[PDB]
Design a protein around this ligand. Structure first.
Ligand code: COA
Ligand code: FNR
Lengths: 847, 141, 94, 353
């Protein structure tokens, strides 16, 4: 229908009023902007002059009626927090919003037996009124008809679930910065959306009042500085830091030498003019890196100046420190998609759902008055539209994966424009993919640039155990990677300094023997370390300390470690070596930003130690290699060895499907238990690896050869155990299996003690395994190892958040939790006084 | 097979006035035999065959009497498979006549043939593995 | 439960879990079921010098999750650090 | 604005929009009614006269609305009454069913996989050729065991003994398709040298060019809304106004012998109940006129395949073309005044008795 848009008349004798009318309003009542002009017929060449007094106020009053549902008051402080009203996310608003922006993602569509999400773009709908109210105060004086939206950005708070239908969302907005630039005033606004008291997401909006502004007393800028890192190598570096008043340790006598410091500073500035600051504040924590790579606060930056040309804190940290960059670029960007989209023919649908009733998008006359090329598309429509493409292509239409999105509004878009968006994977940040996009119009002009942070697919890290080690493992990575170098070098130094051997030397050269010499002062210190290496057992409430390395006394000049083939196969060296290769690989991944913040993890046997150091940083490199060296020595002591370092113990991988299709894991359990009882030798199923395809039997090399021969015989005879025990005879199968075991046991006992285990039909021996790992044979080792673990795993390094729900232990194959149920299940598996005491007394720990 | 039945049809198409006796046998026939079911390929091809009036459709393999051939003559055989009736134009009898008086088969070979129990159509494919009804599949040169 | 008390109990639980792991069987059947089924993991990254656990996950999936993975249309990548560096580091061939 | 689209092919929306059921449902009605009118007018019949020559009518899925509509028709004056009722039923089915289950973007990884494995662009209806209903029902049972209730697939159309259609979420059917692509042997596999019973079953599966899961639990919420819209817009079908039998697509019963609302039953047959095509086509006829859309790809040729050798001739009433095999007719056969108009298809029981 046809409505009045402009009314031009004489208000008074000399005052021309051009009333610009907006008909598309909040309540349906038209809103009028009275533009006033003096008519002075004495100046015939230019008789009309604009009334510039209160002109920005008149424009703001219009925009207030269109945008804000409050009483018109421009007298509020741009420093104060803006409180937006609570917003309930309804299915109807999500429907309307998603249709308006062309977001066809299923997460936002009502489906049976399933909760409807809101897109993160919906944050601008919830937060618009709070956010936009920031550009209105009297002291932020600008012409809203010349307002440019420079940039918008969303950031999900880590842990926060996406917005849902039903959610009551509260919004706060603060002006981060308002600064006078040569070409206009920039206003940087930060909105925080919260739900149930907890913050969900931050909306960042940058607005530009085009104009000439010189009101520097109303300007201010808050910057979150990049994190700066200093490695304090010398006492000169320490003196240079102590010369800075702003450098303020909590403990003045703190030892900075060899420490890595991180400075997490924020700079608050107020302006006197364009170039000179009237005030500088630079403040924030100074953190030292601990051996676990955790950072803890040891002091503050606290710099405060009046009139200044610069921030000396940040200048110092730039010159002397290194910048820690969270974003890590891939070797080469990975093209994802080149996608066509269209801006709608009309901006009224987006205007209605967004609450952005800015006349320039809908009313030809305002767009003309504002000198625009027409009724331009909402920048926020193009944002939501390109974000829907990212979500579809980069996130494979799993909306939850999109954790951040920023867009720069480079150039204006007209309705019925064909936009081409190039999307690329360019890097990683904290396990999230970093997607760059560039939207061009039909004229190949860049209209929109930005980036998104997309969660990787749900990931599990699994850490291999013993058997997997080979000479040279991790040594390619050690050459190339600084992260891997730091892991190996720290461990190699600890081993050289403490035990007089290089774990790197053993990995690279795999020597058959290694002699440690105890000569000189350094040698006596290393000998002490070997002697001070003790089993700490409690027998009848008495500490009975035993010695590993009995042959090492105060008169020993050397100690030789012995192996048949190479020491990388001896478990006291295998364990550290594997643990380091895994931790070095993982630290390289972490350096490249490849580790999802919520990844799950498990390690197979030894793997559990690397997994815990890697994903949870429970132990330092030094603690780690020490713990697994000891663990390996505990296992070596438990097993008798010959002159060449060979034991009478081993492991076989048994495939119950390779003997007979009817031969189940209960049949294998039965057979193995019977071969154990008959011979009296050690054999147990210890690793459950692949259901009905891979079970590992550990124990006596003779018992393992007997089991191999029994299963070889059962396969060749094609005779079932479960069919006979149920359908033919009761307990006769037991007696029948005894003579089959005896046939194999007689041939096994004759063979010499270091007998080479042979590859059966259903059995393969594990190469480079000499200990019966995970058998009851090692149960005596538990108490001393427990006491050693209690000393070397410090409770301050156990971060429950890094374990809870993420770590799957080998013992209790259930995700780690600190619950009575978890403790009770651990107690049922392995009865322990400390755990039983925790279960019984659980109530006092809760309060 | 299907492909060979298609080739017979192509020959019938090319000589529409010349009578073609399409003698269909399944793998269950005596002598050199296919891997084919007796029924399935007829169910698939019967319509296309019957578009060529010069094709006289003969069913063989597995037959030895009026009783077992009658359903193929009336077409009721195809009804067990939820198809419309599919009558055939005639029958061939290979194995059935091997113990006739005038066949040169030696007396003891006739006794050997007679003593073969045979199996129903559902079991014939066991000949590929082991003796089935006294009969087995072996490979020619 | 207070953060520092939870930390103390977590320390005791972790020390006990590792101590007994020494001389208890490795329940890697149940572990694979927890991370393949209860978490519907899409990327299994094996950190090790050889593909032993990758091989095990690839066989567990083929043996008991072939219909599950089809029905829920979830694509598993089983990556070993030692072979699949290009897939883990996102460095594909030009 | 269909008149605009027909005048100017440039101003016609894209195929995806045309295919959406709020447009496709009523417009497929219009195509069928248009073919019925072209047929009646070129024979110089009234709609009722052409109707009176019919032993019966039925339709496959939404065709059943057009079948009841033409069953009510008498004169050219009152024909637009029947047209309105049909267009109105199909409008509300299209609109309500779309609102109950709108199509959403499918993950591009799923689209890329389906295209690289020479399957269709996924859709809410998957056609499986050369498997039995039991076999298909076994594979949907396996898929449905893992899936939750709102994502479960179901056999929607039993078009033939080995011609089935499964309805449900396109992603759920892509899931079924992954299970099927393991069980299916390659197309160019030679199994001639394998014993018959040991051969790997070979079959076809393609997504249908449709945009809604007809005959599925997904559309059941729309039922009550369609019924209320029909009582509001005064659309009913009375048994006494229906002059020929119209066969139910579920049990093949005459709709005229229903106790309850015929409009409610017809809606139920389209949105919820499966189409048992061989059950509904149990009628005895020498000739079947296929008005529906698709010409040689339509319901006529499907029905021919099911009825081959029973002495039924299908005529595709909507398409002028030449059949080289001449096993079914086109438009020209309806109007031909010579002997070429009365072609009978062979009944094998009678011809080779
Ligand atoms: C056992 C193991 C070596 C098998 O992995 P692999 O070398 O990749 O073996 P594969 O099964 O892929 O096949 C290699 C060949 O080895 C042989 N083989 C493998 N498993 C076998 C078994 N259980 N019995 C007999 N032969 C076997 C076969 O000849 C096989 O060839 P095939 O595939 O034709 O059968 C490996 O999985 C492993 O190291 N697992 C044990 C891990 C463990 O528990 N160690 C920790 C100790 S605390
Ligand atoms: C002893 C013997 C020998 C032959 C055959 C069969 C038998 C039994 N058959 C196949 C034969 O013509 C016919 O196709 C089958 O015998 C039909 O199956 P039944 O044997 O009746 O079940 C056969 N076919 C053919 O074309 N030329 C031949 O030389 C032979 N040889």
């Amino acid at each position: 229908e046809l409505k009045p848009t402009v009314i031009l008349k004489l208000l008074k004798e000399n005052i021309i009023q051009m009333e610009m009318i907006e008909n598309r309003t909040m309540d349906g009542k038209p809103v009028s902007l009275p533009l006033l002009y003096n008519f002075n017929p004495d100046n015939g060449f230019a008789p009309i002059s604009e009334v510039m007094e209160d002109r920005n106020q008149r424009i703001k009053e219009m925009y207030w009626k269109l945008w804000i549902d409050e009483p018109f008051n421009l007298d509020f402080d741009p420093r104060d927090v803006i409180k937006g009203k609570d917003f309930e996310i309804t299915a109807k608003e999500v429907y309307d919003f998603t249709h308006a922006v062309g977001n066809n993602c299923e997460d936002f569509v009502s489906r049976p037996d399933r909760t409807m999400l809101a897109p993160m773009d919906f944050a601008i709908v919830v937060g618009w009124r709070a956010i936009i109210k920031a550009i209105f105060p009297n002291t932020v004086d600008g012409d809203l008809l010349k307002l440019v939206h420079l940039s918008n950005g969303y950031k999900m708070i880590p842990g926060a679930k996406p917005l849902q239908v039903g959610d009551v969302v509260s919004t706060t907005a603060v002006i981060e910065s308002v600064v006078n630039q040569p070409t206009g005033k920039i206003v940087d606004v930060v909105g925080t959306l919260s739900r149930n008291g907890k913050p969900v997401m931050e909306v960042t909006s940058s607005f530009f009042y085009r104009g000439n502004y010189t009101d520097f007393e109303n300007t201010f800028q808050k910057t979150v500085e990049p994190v700066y890192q200093m490695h304090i190598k010398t006492s000169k570096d320490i003196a240079v830091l102590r010369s800075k008043e702003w450098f303020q340790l909590d403990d003045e006598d703190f030892d900075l030498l060899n420490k890595t410091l991180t400075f997490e500073t924020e700079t608050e500035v107020t302006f006197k003019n364009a170039n000179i600051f009237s005030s500088v504040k630079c403040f924030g924590p100074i953190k030292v890196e601990l051996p676990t790579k955790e950072t803890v606060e040891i002091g503050i930056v606290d710099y405060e100046a009046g009139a200044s040309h610069g921030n000396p804190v940040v200048d110092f940290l730039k010159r002397n420190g290194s910048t820690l960059e969270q974003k890590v670029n891939l070797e080469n960007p990975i093209p994802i998609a080149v996608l066509d989209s269209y801006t709608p023919s009309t901006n009224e649908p987006y205007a209605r759902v967004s609450g952005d009733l800015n006349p320039i998008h809908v009313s030809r006359h305002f767009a003309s008055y504002a000198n625009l090329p027409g009724t331009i598309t909402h920048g926020m429509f193009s944002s939501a539209s390109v974000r829907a493409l990212i979500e579809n292509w980069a996130a494979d239409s799993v909306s939850s994966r999109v954790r951040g999105y920023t867009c720069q509004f480079v150039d204006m878009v007209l309705p019925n424009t064909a936009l081409k968006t190039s999307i690329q994977h360019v890097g990683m940040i904290n396990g999230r993919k970093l997607i760059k996009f560039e939207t061009r119009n039909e004229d190949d002009v860049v209209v929109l640039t930005g980036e998104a942070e997309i969660e990787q697919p749900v990931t599990t890290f699994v850490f291999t155990g013993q058997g997997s080690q080979e000479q040279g493992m991790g040594m390619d990575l050690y050459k190339t990677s600084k992260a891997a170098q730091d892991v190996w070098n720290r461990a190699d130094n600890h081993f050289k300094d403490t035990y007089g051997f290089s774990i790197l030397d053993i990995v690279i050269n795999n020597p058959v023997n290694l002699t440690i010499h105890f000569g000189g002062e350094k040698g006596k210190r290393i000998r002490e370390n070997y002697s001070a290496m003790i089993f700490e057992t409690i027998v009848d409430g008495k500490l009975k300390t035993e010695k590993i390395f009995k042959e090492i006394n105060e008169h020993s000049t050397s100690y030789t470690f012995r192996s048949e083939k190479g020491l990388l196969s001896a478990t006291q060296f295998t364990q550290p070596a594997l643990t380091l290769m895994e931790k070095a690989a993982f630290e390289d991944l972490k350096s490249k930003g490849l580790i999802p913040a919520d990844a799950t993890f498990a390690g197979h046997s030894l793997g559990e130690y690397a997994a815990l150091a890697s994903l949870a940083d429970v132990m330092s490199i030094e603690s780690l290699v020490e713990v697994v060296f000891y663990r390996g020595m505990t296992m070596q002591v438990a097993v008798p060895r010959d002159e060449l370092g060979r034991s009478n113990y081993g492991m076989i991988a048994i495939n119950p499907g390779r003997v007979a299709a009817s031969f189940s894991q209960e049949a294998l359990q039965y057979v193995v238990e019977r071969v154990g009882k008959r011979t009296g030798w050690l054999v147990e199923i210890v690793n459950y690896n692949v259901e009905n395809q891979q079970y590992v039997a550990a124990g006596d090399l003779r018992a393992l050869d007997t089991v191999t021969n029994v299963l070889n015989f059962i396969k060749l005879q094609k005779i079932d155990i479960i069919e006979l025990q149920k359908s033919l005879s009761l307990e006769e199968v037991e007696g029948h299996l005894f003579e089959i075991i005896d046939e194999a046991s007689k041939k096994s006992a004759v063979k010499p003690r270091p007998l080479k285990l042979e590859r059966g039909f259903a059995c393969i021996p594990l190469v480079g395994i000499s200990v019966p790992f995970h058998s009851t044979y090692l149960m005596n080792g538990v108490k001393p190892f427990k006491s050693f673990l209690k000393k070397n795993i410090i409770k301050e390094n156990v971060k429950v958040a890094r374990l809870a729900g993420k770590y799957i232990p080998n013992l209790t194959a259930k995700p780690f939790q600190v619950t009575k149920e978890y403790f009770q299940d651990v107690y049922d598996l392995t009865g322990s006084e400390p755990i039983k005491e925790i279960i019984d007394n659980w109530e006092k720990y809760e309060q | 097979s299907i492909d060979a039945i298609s080739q017979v049809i192509n020959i019938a198409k090319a000589h529409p006035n010349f009578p073609i006796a399409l003698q269909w046998t399944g793998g269950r026939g005596g002598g050199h035999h296919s891997f084919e079911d007796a029924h399935t390929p007829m169910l698939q091809m019967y319509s296309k065959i019957r578009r060529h009036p010069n094709i006289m459709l003969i069913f063989g393999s597995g037959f030895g009497s009026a009783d077992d051939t009658y359903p193929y003559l009336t077409g009721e055989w195809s009804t067990k498979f939820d198809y419309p009736p599919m009558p055939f134009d005639g029958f061939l009898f290979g194995s059935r006549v091997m113990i006739a008086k005038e066949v040169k088969t030696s007396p003891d070979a006739k006794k050997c043939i007679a003593a073969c129990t045979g199996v129903p159509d559902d079991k014939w494919e066991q000949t590929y593995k082991k003796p089935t009804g006294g009969i087995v599949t072996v490979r020619s040169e | 439960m207070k953060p520092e008390v939870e930390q103390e109990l977590a320390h005791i639980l972790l020390t006990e879990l590792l101590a007994y792991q020494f001389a208890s069987p490795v329940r890697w059947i149940e572990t694979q079921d927890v991370f393949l089924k209860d978490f519907n993991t899409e990327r299994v990254v094996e950190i090790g010098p050889s593909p032993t656990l990758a091989g095990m996950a690839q066989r567990t999936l083929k043996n008991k999750y072939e219909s599950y993975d089809a029905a829920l249309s979830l694509h598993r990548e089983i990556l070993c650090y030692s072979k699949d560096a290009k897939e883990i580091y996102y460095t594909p061939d030009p | 604005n269909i008149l605009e689209w027909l005048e100017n092919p440039s101003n016609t929306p894209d195929k995806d929009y045309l295919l959406s059921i709020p447009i496709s449902c009523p417009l497929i009605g219009v195509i069928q009614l248009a073919h019925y009118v072209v047929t009646a007018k070129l024979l110089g019949f009234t709609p009722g006269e052409l109707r009176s020559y019919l032993k019966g009518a039925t339709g496959h899925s939404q065709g059943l609305v057009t079948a009841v509509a033409i069953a009510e028709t008498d004169s050219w004056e009152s024909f637009f009454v029947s047209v309105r009722k049909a267009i109105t039923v199909l409008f509300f089915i299209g609109v309500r069913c779309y609102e109950a289950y709108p199509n959403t973007s499918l993950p591009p990884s799923i689209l890329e996989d389906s295209l690289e494995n020479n399957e269709g662009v996924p859709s809410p209806m998957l056609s499986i050729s050369n498997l039995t209903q039991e076999q298909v029902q076994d594979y949907v049972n396996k898929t449905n065991s893992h899936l939750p209730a709102g994502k479960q697939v179901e056999i929607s159309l039993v078009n033939g003994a080995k011609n089935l259609v499964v309805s449900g979420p396109p992603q759920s059917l892509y899931g079924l398709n992954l299970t099927l692509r393991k069980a299916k042997a390659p197309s160019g596999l030679d199994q001639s040298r394998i014993p018959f019973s040991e051969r790997k079953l070979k079959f076809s599966n393609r997504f249908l060019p449709v945009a809604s899961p007809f005959h599925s639990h997904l559309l059941v919420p729309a039922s009550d809304l369609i019924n209320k819209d029909l009582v509001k817009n005064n659309v009913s079908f009375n048994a006494k106004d229906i002059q020929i039998p119209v066969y139910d697509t579920f049990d093949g019963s005459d709709l005229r012998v229903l106790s309850g609302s015929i409009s409610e039953r017809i809606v139920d047959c389209i949105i919820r109940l499966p189409v048992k095509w061989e059950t509904t086509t149990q009628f005895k006829a020498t000739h079947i006129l296929d008005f529906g859309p698709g010409g040689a790809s339509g319901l006529g040729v499907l029905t021919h395949r099911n009825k081959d050798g029973t002495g039924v001739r299908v005529i595709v009433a909507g398409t002028l073309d030449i059949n080289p095999d001449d096993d079914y007719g086109f438009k020209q056969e309806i109007f031909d005044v010579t002997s070429n108009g009365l072609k009978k298809n062979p009944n094998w029981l009678e011809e080779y008795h």
